[PDB]
Design a protein around this ligand. Structure first.
Ligand SMILES: Cc1cc(CCCCCCCOc2ccc(C3=NCCO3)cc2)on1
Ligand SMILES: Cc1cc(CCCCCCCOc2ccc(C3=NCCO3)cc2)on1
Lengths: 273, 236, 255, 40, 273, 59, 59, 57, 40, 40
């Protein structure tokens, strides 16, 4: 492939460099339309800018935490982090979010990796070996109430059991209801005067719940869960302007008030180098 | 039972590896795809669309006005604007090109810089745009500027002029984050003759300026952008 | 003697002529078309009023003055009250449509000024409150009036800051969306053909707008000496290939 | 070799090697030739 | 292959052993040009002197250390070794360096092995199990500031998570900007009067950062990281004189003052055996 | 699931072994090679060039 | 001995995965099947039989 | 596979929607027996409702 | 590839792709045609 | 068998078995024959 062809002096009536940008086109002008060039080859394919590659590496999408401790006398397991659930969602940690929102609709399969590490912040004789059980919990699904409910039987709901310190990995097909996931949605769930707005009414994959299977030892053990997400088989439509201001909320486009100028001011003139 | 040996790296999680995994939802059938206009396949497809450069960066809070390069009637010989070409920083940085370049470590290729004139139709002007390849200082006067890559632009019916910064380089890749060895030059613009307004007309006229990449362009070695960060996880 | 410059669009019982055009944009290089069976889901036969809905409606005019910040209309909202297009809209459960948008602004060879005319698929607005404040329904359904970016923040309304496109992105990059400029010195109209863009084959026309049309002054209007300091901008829009499905009782929507 | 039955479980896809910027860079209705005048 | 051919008495006008070294050549003289030889075969190929073999074994290129401890009240994580970064570079530990600098330009792919072991120098009830997360951080890359910054999300930057005591291994393609890496560079980054000199202005792969993912236990744990590097697919040009004096700095050729004579003095005469 | 048995040596790191590894930079394209005079392939090539001997070591 | 590398997810138990296992009862012979009317293959077969709706829910 | 065929107005002596449930059958009535439909395809096989799948986790 | 000798040890079965609701939805002795009168 | 997609991930290269010291041992412009006089 040639990156530049050889081209010499020109004295024409045919001027490729004068255009009318009002038309909305970006005319494909090249170095050889306005200087004299020599042949050179590309030596490159643009492999690593493919959208499959761009969205295809694992990104941290969520960090939560649960603890193993005596539940005796706990009136609210959920509240003691005896188990914790995650309203699933992919636009909470922000690095991956800016990447996805370069597109309007996106479609892909997900590969999740879940790393779990334990901490024992206060005096323990040892490190126990805990097994985590993260189980999928889609909408209209009996929800776990205690850390050892009938729910955890999970007879119809996919669940994975792995050890703290290890990693769990599985992949979920594209579960969207439509043909693509909306990265943006300028609508409502119905014509209500006070209903919410934006994507949150559409992204409704339900939630993911974690717990330790082990009963309690004499000390307490903090287990912190990190969920990583990798898109595989990516398809993206309609590019948009990149995110400039900071994010404030999952699912709304809102930016913070009295934010700071995002364009760097010159130290000098327009004329400055 | 077949005998095996495990190598160094067993059990590691590399966020960039690509392997098979069990599906959690065995046998599930995804929604059919329907047709949607606009599919993107390569980021190289989109960095060829031009977008506006806030060249007039001199303000103090972001404003629509930093997209406008002003022009003065009757000045002769003088300089319209100047900038270095660190596409990952400075004026370029918020443009779509600048914004994507920042997802990669290295770039190579030609850039297309165009200026669209917005003055009254009955006015006229001749400007010179000059590209100064690495190695010399930003030009200080047109004489200096005109000895490097340049285009005399004659403002006419055809409203825009497309200047190309041809890839001039020893090393075949430059860093997107600004660094010296790897630096690309300067871009300046001067009156060639001068802007002239018709009667009954007055004041400043402005040029809009765009930037996009030539088909020439290469970007490689993906990394994280300095353009976005956060202090606590967001919630709904 | 054909110029890129003169054009005629006849759609239904209405025709537009421009003698100073700058080509026309067809979003994503695709022209509006009906919904194919292979893409269909709802089993209902659809209704295609054709020429009674696919004609040109001219919205009320705006006034560009030196202080203007820009205006924003949503589709199909802007047309919610135009003739039979609108009736069909409130009466069927689902509908689908593409449009021809023609924005008009003429001046003289002594004026200067340049408007950006852009179509943004799925333009989800931001609340000026920040945090996770929502933007109430009424605020994103201005009707033919559209939203005036130089009007004041209101409560439950969107933010109207132009350097941020009403969503946290910079004005400068709107050029990645199908768009066309109106530069008084060149141009006097802008025309964009919009194919139907959605993640579902057909949708509700009232709970979801699928494009915002935005007209934004970028190079300020500058009139000749002792000229009146303003120009009107007119927007005329025509639904094209419209289909309605799931007819019934007639939606009642807030406000 | 796929070891698993479902398609979601396969590795990353392989390069589009599609690439056609014209839907984004030249969505004009009447074709523009480089070198010919923009507005006739 | 014959190592020596058979050759007998000679009384010629053709003298292969008289040459003129001023020419710059090393004339290919053999035993059989000056004594009577018998046939012998080589029995050898020179396999283990191939440059791929010479540069192809893992060498320790870096030892760093980080600790897991309560960051509460630490004003400078980087400074507490709550995480530590490595200005990547291959000429800091010296054994491999002398080997590479036998050549001027070198090109190869790298295979890294990272061994991490833990130490608990002061009273602990136990040994905890820590997961390390080393993440690549190239130039113009938001840099981690705390041990748990958004940076560590590493949504676009390759990162590996492995356990202390284990090893991590991955391989990076040749990331040089030019066609080869310069082992030497007699230049500057620009014609500045005070800019630095030598290779450091060219070797600018950016840096590699490590941290423990675990929160803190009651005791403190020292984790010491050793990075090993193996060249694979080696290509080397222009041999040079081997390094004689000791090294003082990464990237400059400088040797220490009042160094010692590097040539061993005879214990005796020139005539001595 | 195929039955396996691991042998002695599993998990060891031998600095001299030669195996495959995942690339950290999937799909990256290295700079083209250009021609450079002087390529060395074997150390046996270079030890045939003669160099001076500090024979007079007595200093 | 063939060189291997284990990936993330090793040792996990996913209640939805489908693999082979050793039989605890090697060589056992199950009872023959006889014919029984009524075999169901898909839940989609049965949701097409209509059943009564307690529409008058007001009690 | 078609999920619905195209069907238009009807004015017949052949009424598929009147039945006698006392018989014990569930007559296979479709949308196209009582409204005008357009063609649409199934795009689906009913894989995940197989009893092997239902009892197999 | 089965690694084991017994049939119980193989993975899950594969979709019936049988599907015939008529034993449940139309177990009537004399065949009913849709469109013809239910009771003659 | 390569298990990985990228070339960097393959094992060590295989012996040049190239070997030609003359660029280093005899870079003279006019060819010298062993046995013939060095300087004529
Ligand atoms: C923009 C945008 C796009 C998207 C897609 C979000 C969808 C991701 C959620 C779906 C993941 O579904 C799961 C499937 C299985 C499991 C699971 N199996 C065993 C344990 O958890 C968890 C989630 O979200 N925002
Ligand atoms: C002489 C000479 C020659 C050279 C070459 C130095 C280049 C080596 C640095 C490049 C290594 O790049 C990395 C790629 C990936 C990772 C990484 N991936 C996951 C964790 O770290 C780290 C470094 O240096 N000096």
């Amino acid at each position: 492939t040639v990156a530049s062809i050889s081209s010499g002096p020109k004295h024409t009536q045919k001027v490729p460099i004068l255009t009318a940008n009002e038309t909305g086109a970006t005319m494909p002008v090249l170095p050889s339309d306005s200087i004299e060039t020599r042949t050179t080859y590309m030596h490159f394919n643009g492999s690593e800018t493919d959208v499959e590659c761009f969205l295809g590496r694992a990104a941290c999408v969520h960090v939560t935490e649960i603890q193993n401790k005596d539940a005796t006398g706990i009136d609210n397991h959920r509240e003691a982090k005896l188990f914790n659930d995650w309203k699933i969602n992919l636009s909470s940690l922000v690095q991956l979010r800016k990447k996805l929102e370069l597109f309007t609709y996106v479609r892909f399969d997900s590969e999740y990796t879940i790393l779990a590490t334990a901490s024992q912040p206060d005096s323990a004789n040892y490190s126990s070996n805990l097994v985590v059980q993260a189980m999928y919990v889609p909408p209209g699904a009996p929800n776990p109430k205690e850390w050892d409910d009938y729910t955890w039987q999970s007879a119809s709901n996919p669940s994975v059991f792995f050890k703290v310190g290890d990693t769990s990995r599985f992949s979920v097909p594209y579960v969207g209801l439509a043909s693509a996931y909306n990265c943006f949605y300028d609508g409502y769930s119905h014509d209500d005067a006070e209903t919410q707005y934006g994507i949150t009414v559409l992204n409704h994959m339900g939630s993911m719940a974690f717990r330790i299977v082990n009963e309690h030892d004499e000390h307490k053990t903090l287990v912190k869960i990190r969920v990583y997400h990798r898109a595989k088989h990516v398809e993206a439509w309609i590019p948009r302007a990149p995110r400039a201001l900071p994010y404030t909320s999952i699912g709304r486009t809102n930016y913070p008030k009295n934010t700071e100028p995002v364009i760097k001011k010159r130290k000098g003139d327009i004329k400055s180098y | 039972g077949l005998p095996t040996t495990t190598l160094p790296g067993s059990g590691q999680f590399l966020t960039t590896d690509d392997r098979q995994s069990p599906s959690a939802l065995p046998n599930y059938e995804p929604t059919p795809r329907i047709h949607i206009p606009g599919k993107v396949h390569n980021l190289l497809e989109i960095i060829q669309v031009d977008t506006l450069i806030p060249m007039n960066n001199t303000h103090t809070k972001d404003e629509v006005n930093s997209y406008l390069i002003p022009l003065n009637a009757n000045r002769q010989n003088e300089q319209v604007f100047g900038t270095n070409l660190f596409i990952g920083d400075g004026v370029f940085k918020t443009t779509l090109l600048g914004e994507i370049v920042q997802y990669y470590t290295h770039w190579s290729g030609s850039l297309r810089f165009s200026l669209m004139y917005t003055g009254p139709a009955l006015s006229s002007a001749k400007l010179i745009l000059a590209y100064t390849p690495p190695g010399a200082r930003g030009p200080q006067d047109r004489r200096e500027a005109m000895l490097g890559t340049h285009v005399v632009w004659d403002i006419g019916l055809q409203s825009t002029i497309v200047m190309t910064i041809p890839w001039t380089s020893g090393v075949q890749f430059r860093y997107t984050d600004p660094d010296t060895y790897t630096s690309a030059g300067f871009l300046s613009c001067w009156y060639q003759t001068s802007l002239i307004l018709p009667p009954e007309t007055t004041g400043q006229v402005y040029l809009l300026s765009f930037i996009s990449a030539c088909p020439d362009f290469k970007l490689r070695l993906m990394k994280d952008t300095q353009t976005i960060s956060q202090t606590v996880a967001l919630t709904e | 003697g054909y110029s890129d410059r003169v054009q005629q669009i006849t759609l239904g019982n209405s025709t537009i002529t421009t003698q100073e055009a700058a080509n026309a944009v067809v979003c994503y290089a695709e022209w509006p078309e009906y919904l194919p069976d292979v893409d269909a889901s709802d089993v209902n036969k659809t209704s295609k009023p054709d020429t009674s809905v696919c004609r040109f409606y001219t919205l009320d005019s705006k006034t560009w003055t030196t202080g203007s910040k820009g205006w924003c209309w949503k589709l199909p909202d802007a047309l919610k009250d135009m003739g039979v297009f609108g009736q069909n809209m409130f009466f069927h459960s689902l509908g689908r449509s593409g449009y021809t948008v023609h924005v008009q602004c003429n001046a003289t060879k002594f004026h200067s000024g340049c408007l950006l005319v852009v179509v943004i698929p799925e333009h989800q607005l931001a609340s000026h409150e920040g945090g996770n404040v929502s933007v109430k329904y009424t605020f994103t359904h201005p009707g033919e009036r559209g939203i005036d970016l130089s009007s004041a923040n209101e409560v439950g309304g969107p933010v109207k800051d132009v350097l941020y496109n009403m969503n946290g992105t910079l004005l400068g990059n709107l050029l990645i969306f199908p768009h066309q400029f109106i530069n008084l010195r060149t141009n006097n109209t802008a025309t964009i053909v919009i194919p139907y863009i959605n993640s579902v084959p057909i949708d509700s026309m009232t709970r979801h707008n699928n494009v915002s049309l935005m007209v934004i002054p970028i190079a300020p209007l500058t009139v000749p000496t002792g000229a009146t300091p303003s120009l009107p901008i007119t927007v005329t829009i025509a639904p094209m290939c419209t289909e309605f499905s799931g007819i019934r009782s007639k939606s009642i929507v807030p406000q | 070799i796929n070891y698993y039955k479902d398609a979601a479980s396969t590795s990353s896809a392989g390069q589009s090697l599609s690439m056609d910027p014209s839907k984004f860079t030249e969505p004009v209705k009447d074709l523009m030739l480089k070198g010919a005048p923009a507005l006739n």
